[PDB]
Design a protein around this ligand. Structure first.
Ligand code: CLA
Ligand code: CLA
Ligand code: CLA
Ligand code: CLA
Ligand code: CLA
Ligand code: CLA
Ligand code: CLA
Ligand code: CLA
Ligand SMILES: CC(/C=C/C=C(C)/C=C/[C@@]12O[C@]1(C)C[C@@H](O)CC2(C)C)=C\C=C\C=C(C)\C=C\C=C(C)\C=C\[C@@]12O[C@]1(C)C[C@@H](O)CC2(C)C
Ligand SMILES: CC(/C=C/C=C(C)/C=C/[C@@]12O[C@]1(C)C[C@@H](O)CC2(C)C)=C\C=C\C=C(C)\C=C\C=C(C)\C=C\[C@@]12O[C@]1(C)C[C@@H](O)CC2(C)C
Lengths: 164, 41, 215, 210, 194
């Protein structure tokens, strides 16, 4: 109960919709023998389903008027009420991987311009070079903020313009 | 076969190997971790 | 010289004379994080102070832990010793951490400026006559003066020994604390309790018999 | 690396154990004392751990030797591990407070001799009494030699001191384990090994306990 | 000079032998700059003089029987009616604290930020002993030595009261009543183990 909401372990339309889905799976399950793999598959679907509802209520996800897990994307309402795993943890779990791919792709382009013809090595990726920058870019925020302090991250007004 | 490894190191071939890597990694994780809507512990 | 892998090419930013003049230089940088020289100099200051806080920390965990399992103390486990000693106390933890960050923050922000410019706090008129002894040494991370009461600094030989003994006991203590956290999540017992469990049955009681080296 | 006596006769030598130190035979297989700033420390570290052990083994055996003969002491027959709980005119905390101040004199007097030899031989309040000059750290002399020894043949007496010392450090390290496994007085472990020497080695007492 | 504090040690070059109370005792090299040392020679005497007044007031209360030094500010809390020589003084805490803030800063500002002198020649020598001719550095040495003893002894009052909770004479009588059982080791504070 943060913004008119309720815990999904406490709401009833959530549990009503769980019983709605398991009803649809079981009336689909009835057409098969109890040994048959079209019934082994559906009972494995249920145990993935029933554990999914158990795990969403375990994490304390917020339901509402429709009985669905609602997310809270604000720190200070997720840090305070124990919901940083909804948005506030994957907003840095993403931005680690995002700037990682950016930094590896940056370092591959920076370390290819001092060559004979760098356009050839954007077709033919230097795999012993590219994987070497791939592994060693794992501390990229530790390397970027040191490059941020110099002035070597931002190229100056050598950049190309039209008519300022 | 050095010329054959250049072909394996072109742009679309590394793209179709790395995308089978990255999808195939996320497929195996989403098998052994069924339905991660929220970061649990 | 004496690399962490005897067959590896040591990266070139650990073989410069401003990097081979450094304690704990075993050629170990498989991410290249200290290729920039001031970034090496900044991370060298991060390693000295992550290790000295860990050596003080680990000696605040196992030394009152070994001297509890042997009797003559009643200090509880380190993951529960924050819960106790606040009732044998006077402030809330909020009222205690804020005075902590004031006291620690005055120190750390002076060490911050001495890293930025060595001999910062040795300028006259900073303190009340006490600022004279705060120029450090010719190399940073090793202040001396009032931080060396026994006077071990003034040798210039046996000195790289005390450097490298500090770092190696320091790096071992950082792995010890990364130990202590991990051997509290995985089994919930004490670190000396995990040492007692491994000594009474080495070949069955380890991290191969819990759910964290799972296949 | 000469015709010095050796711990393994014919073995190669480290080269820095020529013979100036008291009673060397080249035994340093871990190469611990290559640095002379560590070897000078380890030489004095050997003598102090030796001399306190010769006090220890003579301080354990002789109160047990003259008690199993049977004399009358206030502490008679009490074990050396059972002498800590034994009561005295004072609790053992206050005794430890006296030690940590009297030795804080003597050890710092001895350490000031180690950092500069020839600069510790003067009393504070009696400024006529002094030990004679020319001594080395670990061998003060003067009033420390009241019977008038060390006036000739000092090398063999230092060799006797380190050999009677190294036997004692092995004996006190004997006293630790051999009173921890079987839990008896280590003069009375000699009684079982002289009762039936063939039916109690270290192996059969290990294997019976295992 | 007149002393070495650890015989055989070299003397620090930044401690002049002319200075009263000198032994060459600065293992931290804590006064290597001359302005820092000049402030410290001012501050050691004033710490020494206030502690000699401090340790005398802590003793003469128990020598005259008025509780101890720790219990003399136990009227501002848990009651009132402060005493001195047994005589009442009808001041609460919040008035004399304001009196000793104005009047003491009025004597500090005449002392501290009006120079840097620590042996003022003139009105602070009523009878006249040190006319700075010959007997000055001798009596300045004694003011340091009795002063350094007082700063140790006051630190030996706070740590004694933090450990045992008893006053100076109240436990000096106990060390004389039990020489081996009333020292700093029988309490489980100064030595934690035995
Ligand atoms: C568009 C931006 C925005 C808006 C409208 C709000 C809105 C709000 N924040 Mg908030 N917040 C934001 C960004 C924002 N936040 C960011 C970027 C941070 C830093 C990570 C915070 C940190 C934060 C804290 C620490 C707290 C709030 C609180 C609040 C509430 C007052 C309100 C719902 C407070 C709250 O819960 O209500 C008092 C509270 O404690 N927020
Ligand atoms: C956070 C503590 C910390 C910090 C700041 C450093 C920093 C440093 N170490 Mg060090 N080290 C540490 C812990 C640390 N180490 C531990 C615990 C060990 C024992 C395994 C070592 C063992 C070690 C060796 C053997 C060597 C170094 C070296 C170095 C230097 C260059 C490597 C580099 O760029 O690292 C910078 C790294 C950081 C600033 C932080 C990285 C944190 C990562 C991302 C987390 C990793 C978690 C881990 C996987 C679990 C640099 C000064 C080399 C050196 O001194 O030569 C000059 C060297 O030869 N270290
Ligand atoms: C560094 C550091 C580390 C690793 C921890 C780690 C921990 N603290 Mg802790 N703590 C710290 C600093 C730290 N704290 C500081 C600076 C303070 C002072 C404000 C506290 C006050 C504190 C309290 C009051 C409690 C903890 C508790 C805990 C445990 C929570 C699980 C965990 C082991 C809790 C605990 O141990 O409960 C079992 C607990 O109750 N800590
Ligand atoms: C080294 C060393 C150490 C640490 C000890 C320690 C001890 N000895 Mg011991 N001892 C030693 C060497 C040592 N001994 C040697 C070399 C001999 C020979 C003895 C002969 C000996 C006897 C015969 C007795 C002890 C006793 C004791 C215990 C009490 C000491 C006592 O009453 O104060 C002694 C206090 C003194 C004031 C004497 C010191 C003055 C010296 C002799 C001046 C020279 C204590 C465990 C007693 C014991 O077992 O108690 C249960 C006991 O009866 N010792
Ligand atoms: C048996 C071992 C032994 C031997 C051979 C020596 C030999 C030597 N010591 Mg040494 N010493 C020893 C044990 C020994 N010490 C111990 C245990 C201590 C600690 C108390 C010392 C403390 C010591 C000092 C402080 C000094 C020496 C000095 C000397 C030298 C000349 C004195 C001499 O001839 O002593 C000959 C030794 C003996 C004759 C041993 C007599 C033992 C009898 C039996 C008494 C034991 C009774 C016991 C309590 C009960 C049994 C010579 C190198 C002096 C030196 O080098 O000056 C130039 C010097 O200053 N040693
Ligand atoms: C100082 C020499 C010394 C001597 C004379 C003894 C003598 C004895 N020990 Mg002992 N011991 C010693 C050192 C010594 N130990 C050390 C250093 C340790 C620690 C590792 C032990 C640990 C130990 C245990 C755990 C046990 C004994 C036992 C015994 C007794 C049975 C004999 C046996 O099994 O040999 C044991 C032999 C060894 C452990 C090898 C030690 C070899 C030494 C260090 C070198 C040899 C010294 C010398 C060259 C030869 C002796 C002659 C010399 C004394 C003149 C016997 C009385 C057993 C017992 O009490 O049963 C009755 C038993 O259970 N000892
Ligand atoms: C706070 C009081 C205080 C101050 C300012 C000084 C100041 C001085 N002393 Mg002094 N001293 C004091 C107390 C003090 N002393 C006490 C109590 C003793 C007896 C134990 C001595 C014994 C002593 C000797 C024997 C000698 C000096 C000397 C000196 C001079 C140079 C050393 C120096 O830089 O010290 C500066 C000191 C400080 C800034 C105090 C720092 C305190 C730190 C921050 C914490 C200490 C904690 C404490 C130990 C336990 C709590 C300087 C004028 C030397 C000299 O030439 O005499 C004039 C000298 O030879 N002092
Ligand atoms: C409220 C009026 C007042 C004012 C304006 C001053 C002003 C002054 N006093 Mg002063 N003083 C006062 C009241 C006052 N005092 C009282 C009431 C006493 C007697 C209790 C003293 C006792 C005194 C001594 C003994 C000394 C001075 C000194 C000084 C001068 C140094 C200024 C300085 O460094 O600031 C600093 C401002 C402060 C408020 C000081 C900070 C508090 C100190 C550090 C006390 C804490 C001690 C504690 C044990 C240390 C912390 C623990 C640590 C070990 C971890 C300055 C002229 C010093 C001097 O002459 O030069 C000197 O040596 N005064
Ligand atoms: C600071 C620290 C711990 C300090 C702990 C303290 C003070 C504990 C205090 C307490 O316990 C007590 C005393 C009492 C308790 O009651 C209360 C608390 C408060 C709990 C650990 C550091 C721990 C630091 C650790 C573990 C760092 C490990 C880093 C590693 C291994 C990195 C290696 C690399 O980065 C390099 C070197 C180079 C790259 O190229 C390659 C890779 C491999 C990436
Ligand atoms: C101990 C002390 C200073 C100690 C400092 C030392 C040893 C420093 C030594 C070193 O720096 C050197 C020399 C050289 C460096 O290289 C090394 C070190 C080792 C760092 C000052 C105490 C100084 C102590 C002082 C000034 C005490 C003053 C007390 C007063 C006035 C008491 C008043 C009262 O007691 C009465 C009178 C009546 C009661 O009822 C009420 C109250 C109010 C409690």
């Amino acid at each position: 109960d943060i913004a008119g909401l309720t815990p999904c372990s406490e709401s009833k339309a959530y549990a009503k919709l769980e019983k709605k889905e398991l009803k649809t799976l079981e009336k689909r399950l009835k057409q098969y023998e109890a040994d048959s793999a079209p019934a082994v598959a559906l009972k494995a679907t249920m145990e993935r389903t029933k554990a999914r509802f158990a795990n969403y209520a375990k994490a304390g996800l917020l339901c509402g008027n429709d009985g669905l897990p609602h997310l809270i994307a604000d720190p200070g309402l997720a840090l305070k009420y124990g919901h940083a795993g909804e948005v506030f943890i994957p907003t840095f779990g993403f931005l680690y991987v995002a700037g990682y791919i950016g930094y590896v792709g940056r370092q591959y382009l920076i370390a290819v311009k001092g060559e004979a013809k760098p356009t050839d090595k954007e077709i033919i990726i230097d795999v012993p070079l590219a994987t070497k920058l791939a592994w060693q870019g794992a501390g990229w925020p530790l390397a970027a903020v040191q490059e941020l302090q110099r002035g070597t991250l931002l190229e100056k007004e050598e950049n190309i313009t039209v008519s300022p | 076969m050095k010329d054959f490894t250049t072909y394996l190191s072109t742009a679309p071939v590394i793209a179709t190997i790395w995308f089978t890597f990255t999808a195939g990694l996320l497929i195996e994780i989403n098998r052994y971790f069924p339905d991660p809507l929220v970061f649990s512990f | 010289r004496q690399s962490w892998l005897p067959g590896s090419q040591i990266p070139a930013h650990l073989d410069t004379p401003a990097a081979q003049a450094l304690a704990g230089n075993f050629g170990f940088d498989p991410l290249g994080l200290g290729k920039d020289p001031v970034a090496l100099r900044w991370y060298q200051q991060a390693e000295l102070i992550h290790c000295r806080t860990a050596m003080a920390g680990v000696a605040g965990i196992l030394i009152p832990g070994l001297l509890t399992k042997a009797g003559a103390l009643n200090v509880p486990e380190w993951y529960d010793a924050g819960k106790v000693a606040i009732e044998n106390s006077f402030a809330p933890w909020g009222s205690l951490l804020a005075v902590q960050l004031f006291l620690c923050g005055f120190v750390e922000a002076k060490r911050w400026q001495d890293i930025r410019k060595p001999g910062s706090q040795g300028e006259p008129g900073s303190f009340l006559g006490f600022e004279a002894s705060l120029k450090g040494t010719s190399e940073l991370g090793y202040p001396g003066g009032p931080f060396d009461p026994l006077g071990l600094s003034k040798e210039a030989d046996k000195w790289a020994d005390w450097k490298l003994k500090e770092v190696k006991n320091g790096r071992l203590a950082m792995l010890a604390f990364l130990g202590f956290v991990a051997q509290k999540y995985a089994t919930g017992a004490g670190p000396v309790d995990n040492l007692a469990a491994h000594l009474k049955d080495p070949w069955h009681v380890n991290y191969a018999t819990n759910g964290v080296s799972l296949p | 690396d000469a015709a010095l006596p050796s711990w393994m006769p014919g073995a190669d030598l480290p080269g820095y154990l020529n013979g100036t130190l008291p009673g060397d035979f080249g035994f340093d297989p871990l190469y611990l004392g290559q640095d002379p700033v560590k070897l000078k420390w380890y030489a004095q570290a050997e003598l102090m751990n030796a001399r306190f052990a010769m006090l220890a083994v003579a301080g354990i055996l002789v109160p047990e030797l003259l008690s199993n003969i049977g004399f009358s002491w206030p502490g008679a027959g009490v074990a050396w591990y059972d002498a800590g709980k034994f009561e005295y005119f004072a609790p053992a905390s206050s005794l430890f407070g006296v030690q940590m101040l009297l030795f804080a004199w003597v050890e710092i007097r001895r350490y000031q001799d180690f950092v500069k030899p020839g600069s510790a031989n003067q009393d504070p309040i009696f400024t006529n009494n002094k030990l004679p000059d020319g001594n080395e750290p670990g061998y003060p002399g003067g009033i420390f030699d009241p019977f008038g020894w060390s006036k000739g043949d000092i090398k063999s007496l230092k060799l006797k001191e380190i050999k009677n010392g190294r036997l004692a450090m092995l004996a006190f390290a004997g006293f630790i384990g051999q009173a921890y496994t079987t839990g008896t007085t280590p003069l009375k472990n000699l009684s079982t090994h002289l009762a039936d020497p063939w039916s109690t080695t270290v192996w059969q007492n290990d294997l019976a306990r295992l | 000079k007149a002393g070495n504090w650890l015989p055989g040690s070299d003397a620090p070059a930044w401690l002049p032998d002319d200075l009263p109370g000198n032994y060459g005792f600065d293992p931290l090299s804590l006064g290597k700059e001359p302005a820092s040392l000049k402030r410290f020679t001012e501050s050691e005497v004033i710490h020494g003089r206030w502690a000699m007044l401090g340790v005398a007031g802590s003793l003469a209360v128990e020598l005259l029987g008025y509780g101890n030094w720790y219990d003399a500010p136990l009227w501002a809390v848990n009651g009132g009616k402060a005493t001195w020589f047994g005589i009442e003084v009808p001041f609460d805490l919040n008035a004399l604290l304001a009196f000793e803030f104005v009047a003491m800063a009025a004597a500090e500002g005449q002392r501290g930020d009006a120079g840097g002198v620590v042996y003022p020649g003139g009105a602070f020598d009523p009878l006249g002993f040190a006319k700075d001719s010959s007997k000055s550095g001798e009596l300045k040495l004694k003011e340091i030595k009795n002063g350094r003893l007082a700063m140790v002894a006051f630190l030996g009052f706070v740590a004694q009261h933090a450990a045992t909770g008893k006053g100076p004479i109240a436990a000096l009588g106990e060390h004389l009543a039990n020489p081996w059982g009333a020292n700093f080791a029988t309490n489980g504070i100064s030595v934690p183990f035995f």
